Curated annotation (Swiss-Prot), chain C:
Positions bearing carbohydrate: N38, N51, N72, T91, N111
Domain comment (free text): Contains sequence and structural motifs very similar to those of a bacterial superantigen and can directly bind and activate T-cell receptors. Activation of a broad T-cell repertoire may be involved in the hyperinflammatory syndrome in acute COVID disease. The KxHxx motif seems to function as an ER retrieval and binds COPI in vitro.
Effect seen on changing S106L: In strain: Omicron/BA.2.12.1
Tree of life domain: Viruses
Record's protein name: Spike glycoprotein
Post-translational modification: The cytoplasmic Cys-rich domain is palmitoylated. Palmitoylated spike proteins drive the formation of localized ordered cholesterol and sphingo-lipid-rich lipid nanodomains in the early Golgi, where viral budding occurs. Specific enzymatic cleavages in vivo yield mature proteins. The precursor is processed into S1 and S2 by host furin or unknown proteases to yield the mature S1 and S2 proteins. Processing between S2 and S2' occurs either by host CTSL in endosomes, or by host TMPRSS2 at the cell surface. Both cleavages are necessary for the protein to be fusion competent. Cell surface activation allows the virus to enter the cell despite inhibition of the endosomal pathway by hydroxychloroquine. The polybasic furin cleavage site is absent in SARS-CoV S.
Something else known: Variant D614G has become the most prevalent circulating sequence in the global pandemic since April 2020. The mutation is associated with higher viral loads produced in cell culture and animal models. It would not change pathogenicity nor neutralization properties vs vaccination. May be prevalent because the mutation increases virus transmission in human population.
Biotechnology: Main component of the anti-COVID vaccine Chadox1/AZD1222/AstraZeneca; in which the human tPA leader sequence is added in N-terminus to enhance protein secretion.
Cysteine pairings via disulfide bonds: C52-C64, C77-C86
Length: 184, 320, 118, 36
């Protein structure tokens, strides 16, 4: 459409100026047309580089996304959709790429009574992996991100300090499975 | 032995959503000027749609940063989180804007008739503060699980034991020494509010963003006063003084210089907007990976074994 | 007198020694909030940065808004207007609302309560 | 510090393939319980 702009010429058609006028005036009108079209073209090329820079940054982001998220398990949260991350599968798109980030999302919750440590023989027991929970009748040990209870044994816990220092500590019995083996 | 320290990190998020009436800039209520502007074609509409895309982009920047969480959480009335006093960084309902005291220091430290208009931002500062209040509420109560889905509520001692196990420290170290960590965190909060009450040299980047924008607008206003070889910079003087063709020559010079000035201003705004967009994507990345979870990227979120950050609303920016 | 843009801001009358402060007339951009022409032909005019006096009228911080019946209910944003206000097309007519930040969710924190993904 | 136990350490090979190794005594936690 910016071809159609006169920029002060008698026409936006070059051939009309060439066919109507002597070159001592036609060169001036053509000079105005070159000025206008060159300014419009430089504006266009400027928009072209800025937009191509934006799409370049997007492509660098997409390369980073597939190089981390597709080619391995990127545990950076919210880089690859909401939730814990498993895969992303790249599919082709017209002038782009579309990923299918398959994610691990928790579904249902359940409230339990917790203690950061328990106390068996005056000694504090911390879980090596997970968190102590209580359903109200027994203190059990479970995973941080899924509910499965186990009996709290010696091999589930590591002993550190006494029961005075930590807060929120309750009184329980730590099972040693080596003791029935000695009784065997 | 060890220490716990908090550190500010100030990132500009969006610019000021500024729109320029192009025909009103070049030709303020003139008929022959609007005729000679429409002779030049669709420069004016292109610059308007470009600046509109800029303003929509900064609104998208603010939205894509601040709206990561959907469920707006709220702190429980029992504020006892292990001795960690969050009273300065929590929003204040007694203040008529529900903002933090830290956010009040952040807002305190930051300082027409030519078609030069300023469009308002879509999200106001109070609802931005409500977003950040939701983010701290989820971070304090639920831990990092609120970015993964449901707000799986956890105690704060359990949360700090989990973050220390994230950086490799076993949980007995924190559970035997939690009061020292709480006192160190509260003292570091005191030092950061003292540093924010000290000087604005931390906020010099955000002030520099606003100052760059003001410099661009003021230079555009001064370029209105430029003749560009005309006999006057006032259009109505030339229209009063001269015959219409002899006026229109000077009008051609004025539209030429002013269109070059507007293209220059739009180009600077476009490059600065791309810079601000990249900074906004960086800020969104930092908040998504450090607020919503525990990052193991070193130096991405300040020097040291990183645990978390807490966002604070800033005028045209965010602060962790 | 002159303004910051080298424009005449104030004058003195030539016949009588009287000083006059010149302010240019109240102007602002015109925005049209509409849904699609597939859906309706109803339009709402948003005047920008003027009060609703100098122009079914509601006043925004962005300026004068004509044709949006203002609602005290809060919805999710469909057409953004400015300063937390968004528009939608429901029963139909164009309405304006303070846009919702989402649903509030109180979190039951305790010093021994947990939530586990079963 | 804690005492080197059998559940603190995992055995691998022999003690001539590794550089910088010193000599010590590994405490067995199975030893006093097996004695009991």
């Amino acid at each position: 459409k910016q071809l159609s702009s006169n920029f002060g010429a008698i026409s936006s058609v070059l051939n009309d100026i060439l066919s109507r006028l002597d070159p001592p005036e036609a060169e001036v009108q053509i000079d105005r047309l070159i000025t206008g079209r060159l300014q419009s073209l430089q504006t266009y090329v400027t928009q072209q580089l800025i937009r191509a820079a934006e799409i370049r940054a997007s492509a660098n982001l997409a390369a980073t996304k597939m190089s981390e998220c597709v080619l391995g398990q990127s545990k950076r949260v919210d880089f690859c959709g909401k939730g814990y991350h498993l895969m992303s599968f790249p599919q082709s798109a017209p002038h782009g790429v579309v990923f299918l980030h398959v994610t691990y999302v928790p579904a249902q919750e359940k409230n339990f009574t917790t203690a950061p440590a328990i106390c068996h023989d005056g000694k504090a027991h911390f879980p090596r992996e997970g968190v102590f929970v209580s359903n109200g009748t027994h203190w059990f040990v479970t995973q941080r991100n899924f509910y499965e209870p186990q009996i709290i044994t010696t091999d589930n816990t590591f002993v550190s300090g006494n029961c005075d220092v930590v807060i929120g500590i309750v009184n329980n019995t730590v099972y040693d499975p080596l003791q029935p083996e000695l009784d065997s | 032995n060890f220490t716990i320290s908090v550190t500010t990190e100030i990132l500009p998020v969006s610019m000021t959503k500024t729109s320029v009436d192009c025909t009103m800039y070049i030709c303020g209520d003139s008929t022959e000027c609007s005729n000679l502007l429409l002779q030049y074609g669709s420069f004016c509409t292109q610059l308007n749609r470009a600046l509109t895309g800029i303003a929509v982009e900064q609104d998208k920047n603010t939205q894509e940063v601040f709206a990561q969480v959907k469920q707006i959480y709220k702190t429980p009335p029992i504020k006892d989180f292990g001795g960690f006093n969050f009273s300065q960084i929590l929003p204040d309902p007694s203040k008529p804007s529900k903002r933090s005291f830290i956010e009040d220091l952040l807002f305190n430290k930051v300082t027409k008739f030519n078609g030069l208009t300023v469009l308002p931002p879509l999200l106001t500062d109070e609802m931005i503060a409500q977003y950040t209040s939701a983010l701290l509420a989820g971070t304090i109560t639920s831990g990092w699980t609120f970015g993964a889905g449901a707000a799986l509520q956890i105690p704060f001692a359990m949360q700090m034991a989990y973050r220390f196990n994230g950086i490799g420290v076993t949980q007995n170290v924190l559970y035997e020494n939690q009061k020292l960590i709480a006192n160190q965190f509260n003292s570091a909060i005191g030092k950061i509010q003292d540093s924010l009450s000290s000087t604005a040299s931390a906020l010099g980047k955000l002030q520099d963003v606003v100052n760059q924008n003001a410099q661009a607008l003021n230079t555009l206003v001064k370029q209105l006063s430029s003749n560009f070889g005309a006999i006057s910079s006032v259009l109505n003087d030339i229209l009063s003084r001269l015959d219409p063709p002899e006026a229109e020559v000077q009008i051609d010079r004025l539209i030429t210089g002013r269109l070059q000035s507007l293209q220059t201003y739009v180009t600077q705004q476009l490059i600065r907007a791309a810079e601000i967009r990249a900074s906004a994507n960086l800020a969104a990345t930092k908040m998504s990976e450090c607020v919503l979870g525990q990052s193991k990227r070193v130096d991405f979120c300040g020097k040291g074994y990183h645990l978390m950050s807490f966002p604070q609303s800033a005028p045209h920016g965010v602060v962790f | 007198g002159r303004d910051i843009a080298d424009t005449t801001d104030a004058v003195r009358d030539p016949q009588t020694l009287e000083i006059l402060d010149i302010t240019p007339c109240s102007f602002g951009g015109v925005s049209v909030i509409t849904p699609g022409t597939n859906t309706s032909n109803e339009v709402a005019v948003l005047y920008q940065d003027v009060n609703c006096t100098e122009v079914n009228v509601f006043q925004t911080r962005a300026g004068c808004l004509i044709g949006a019946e203002y609602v005290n209910n809060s919805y999710e944003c469909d057409i953004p207007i400015g300063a937390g206000i968004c528009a939608s097309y429901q029963t139909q007519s164009i309405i304006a609302y303070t846009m919702s930040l989402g649903a509030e969710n109180s979190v039951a924190y305790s010093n021994n309560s947990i939530a586990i993904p079963t």
